[PDB]
Amino acid sequence: MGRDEAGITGTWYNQLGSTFIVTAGADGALTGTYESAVGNAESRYVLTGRYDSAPATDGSGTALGWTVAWKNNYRNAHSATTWSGQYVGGAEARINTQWLLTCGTTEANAWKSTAVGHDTFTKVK
Amino acid sequence: MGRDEAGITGTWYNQLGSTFIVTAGADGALTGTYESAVGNAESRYVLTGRYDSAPATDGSGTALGWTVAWKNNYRNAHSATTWSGQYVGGAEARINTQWLLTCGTTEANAWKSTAVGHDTFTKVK
Amino acid sequence: MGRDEAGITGTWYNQLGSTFIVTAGADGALTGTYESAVGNAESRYVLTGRYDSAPATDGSGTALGWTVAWKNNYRNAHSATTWSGQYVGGAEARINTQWLLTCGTTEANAWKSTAVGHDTFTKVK
Amino acid sequence: MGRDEAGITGTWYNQLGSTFIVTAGADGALTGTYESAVGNAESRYVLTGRYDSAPATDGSGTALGWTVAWKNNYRNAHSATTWSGQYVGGAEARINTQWLLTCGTTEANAWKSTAVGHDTFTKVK
Ligand SMILES: O=C(CCCC[C@@H]1SC[C@@H]2NC(=O)N[C@@H]21)NCCCN(CCc1ccccn1)CCc1ccccn1
Ligand SMILES: O=C(CCCC[C@@H]1SC[C@@H]2NC(=O)N[C@@H]21)NCCCN(CCc1ccccn1)CCc1ccccn1
Ligand SMILES: O=C(CCCC[C@@H]1SC[C@@H]2NC(=O)N[C@@H]21)NCCCN(CCc1ccccn1)CCc1ccccn1
Ligand SMILES: O=C(CCCC[C@@H]1SC[C@@H]2NC(=O)N[C@@H]21)NCCCN(CCc1ccccn1)CCc1ccccn1
Ligand SMILES: [Cu+2]
Ligand SMILES: [Cu+2]
Ligand SMILES: [Cu+2]
Ligand SMILES: [Cu+2]
Ligand SMILES: [Cu+2]
Ligand SMILES: [Cu+2]
Ligand SMILES: [Cu+2]
Ligand SMILES: [Cu+2]
Ligand SMILES: [Cu+2]
Ligand SMILES: [Cu+2]
Ligand SMILES: [Cu+2]
Ligand SMILES: [Cu+2]
């Protein structure tokens, strides 16, 4: 089993009020659903990702990332977000991320295809 | 089946000489392996991601993303990369991406945890 | 004079304890000094940048950016950071930024030349 | 005078057809004008930035960055772009950059305030 498998598995919330539901597998897999409180999104979207299942023991965080394509049974926003970050355990566990949101564009609009931002996830709120 | 399921599935190469082997599923899943020609990496790493399986028909690209955690049977670089981008079909098919590489760090080093860059993948080279 | 010339001019502090001293000119110029609490840096570095001197009046923030090259009389870290963001006035004024730190590299190391992060500046601390 | 003062000073063009006119000062300053071939922009905009005026001599590039606020006498797009990158001299001199474009937004739209991309500048085209 992964070092932080139990620490990562569960329900997380970011500063926007979005809900990140994830299961960390012993093999390094991340699976679950994402519900965004903002943007062209409603209800849950499939997510998949990976995490370091044997992290350093020097107090460093645990690197991880995941992807949502913004298509479900309700809506298709023709776009995908990837979150890249690290899990930090302890009393106030956190997943600190930066993200890249790419829209499908024509080639003439490709220069403005990608948004960047940062989300912090906690176990509360 | 996804609109670009056949277009995306296969072997891709980026400008560094890295090899991206991916299968696009009818459900929007991306699965496969990544081999980086640079950095603290050797041989293949598991990847997983998502793509828009019903993209726009106005000539826009197909949004997608995937994650590699840099742990395999040979090495563990305690880090993860996410690629966010779009697939562009046609004679010279391309996957144009930007990426975020996060290292697990102490909190004192978290400000410098994340590298950003851009990779273009083609079916040749 | 710029709409937020007086709001922006002054001393700001980010979450790392770095000090951003800036003067906003009527013409859209930003001038001043930056002192980083972290990294290969000591004492003050020259900065220059630009801001929107006639922002929207619909409650939107004021877009701005600036650059530091990490060379002064004490040290040269062969690198430059740019901050891109917006000023938000009011009781708890803030400058919310994302930044790109590029190191001079050989071409073989150029893929890992750039760090990305986010700093929030306030008038206190 | 800066090591690459003469190498950097002049007219540059990126892959979009935008024109970057810059003067590198002996003190590390960058001054000039930017004309974007795309987006909410017409004619020239003021730019200012900084570069490493005493770079490494091991073949590494020269770190630099600059800012444009997208306001001039013709238009105001209430936004600013910062380019962060490095100058690479030689027969085919290049300035390789990544950039952050921030729009002034309401707080409700701040999550989508920032675009990210990459521009390569050459002395031809
Ligand atoms: O809302 C969505 C899906 C929901 C996204 C929610 C985000 S994930 C990161 C963050 N954390 C979170 O919990 N929730 C948010 N997806 C399309 C987003 C529309 N774009 C316009 C289309 C377009 C056309 C042409 C060029 C570019 N886009 C947004 C505008 C924009 C700004 C900057 C860069 C790219 N796009
Ligand atoms: O090599 C690796 C794994 C291989 C990465 C290969 C990359 S994926 C994007 C690109 N496309 C590709 O095909 N191949 C490359 N992983 C650790 C990378 C070491 N870092 C030092 C550790 C550290 C300690 C403290 C703070 C930050 N890192 C790299 C240095 C760095 C620079 C900037 C930002 C973050 N880290
Ligand atoms: O410390 C510095 C100067 C001080 C930077 C302070 C930063 S500004 C953003 C932030 N807000 C703030 O208030 N303070 C910090 N400058 C070089 C930074 C060394 N790098 C290693 C050299 C190298 C060699 C080869 C490839 C890449 N770098 C850092 C490691 C790194 C990680 C990821 C991407 C790039 N570089
Ligand atoms: O065109 C401009 C000014 C010209 C920009 C030209 C760019 S510089 C980088 C690149 N290299 C170059 O040579 N030329 C381009 N400036 C506003 C740009 C409108 N935005 C909509 C407003 C808005 C409202 C709410 C939230 C976000 N924006 C663009 C859409 C967008 C997508 C993603 C992230 C942010 N904004
Ligand atoms: Cu949009
Ligand atoms: Cu280890
Ligand atoms: Cu978009
Ligand atoms: Cu490293
Ligand atoms: Cu559609
Ligand atoms: Cu690293
Ligand atoms: Cu370093
Ligand atoms: Cu206006
Ligand atoms: Cu560096
Ligand atoms: Cu726009
Ligand atoms: Cu030196
Ligand atoms: Cu915008």
d(CA B105, CA A98): 15
Specify the residue for token string 């739209």. D109
Contact D125, D14 (CB under 8 A): no
Which residue type, as a one-letter code, is found at position A58? D
Resolution in A: 1.5
Residue nearest to atom 22 of ligand 1 (CA): A103
Which residues in chain D are closer than 8 Å to C78, comparing Cβ atoms? 52, 55-56, 60, 63
* Sequence-separated contacts (24+) of C24-27 with Cβ below 8 Å: C24/C51, C24/C53, C26/C1, C26/C2, C26/C53, C27/C53, C27/D46
d(CA D87, CA B96): 23
Pick the atom of ligand 3 nearest to C119's CA: 11
3-state secondary structure D17-50: CCEEEEEECCCCEEEEEEECCCCCCCCCEEEEEE
Give me D122's structure tokens: 């050459």
d(CA D104, CA C5): 16
Q: Which residues contact C109 (CB under 8 A, 6 or more apart)?
A: none
B69 touching A (Cβ < 8 Å): yes
Query: How far does Cα B24 stand from its chain's mean position?
Result: 12
User: What is the CA angle D52-B110-B120, rounded to 5?
Assistant: 65
Q: Which ligand is closest in space to the CA of residue C70?
A: 3
Distance (Å) of CA C74 to CA C45, D57, D110: 10, 18, 38
CB atoms within 10 A of CB B93: 17
Nearest to A63 by CA among B73, B43, B115, C112: B115
Q: Give the residue from chain B lying closest to C118, CA to CA.
A: B111
What is the 8-class DSSP label of residue B108?
G
Dihedral angle computed from the Cα positions of residues B90, B94, B95 and B97, in that order, rounded to the nearest 10 degrees = -130
Pick the atom of ligand 1 nearest to A103's CA: 28
Interface list for D 87-106 with B (CB within 8 A):
98
Method by which the coordinates were obtained: X-ray
Pick the atom of ligand 1 nearest to A16's CA: 13
d(CA A79, CA A101): 7
Q: Which residues contact A92 (CB under 8 A, 6 or more apart)?
A: A122
Specify the residue for token string 């994830």. A22
Which residues in chain D are closer than 8 Å to C102, comparing Cβ atoms? 63-65, 84-86, 97-98
Alpha helices in chain A (DSSP H): 5-8
Residue nearest to atom 23 of ligand 3 (CA): C103
Ligand 12 center to D46 CA (angstroms): 18
DSSP line for chain D: --TTHHHHSEEEEETT--EEEEEE-TTSEEEEEEE-SSSS--S-EEEEEEE-SS--SSS--EEEEEEEEEE-SS-EEEEEEEEEEEEE-STT-EEEEEEEEEE---GGGGGG-EEEEEEEEES--
d(CA C32, CA C47): 5
Phi-psi category of residue A58: left, alpha or beta, with phi > 0 → left and psi -120 to 50 → alpha:
alpha
Give me D68's structure tokens: 């444009």
Domains of chain C and any CATH numbers: 5-122 (2.40.128.30)
Specify the residue for token string 């002064």. C72
Which residue type, as a one-letter code, is found at position B84? S
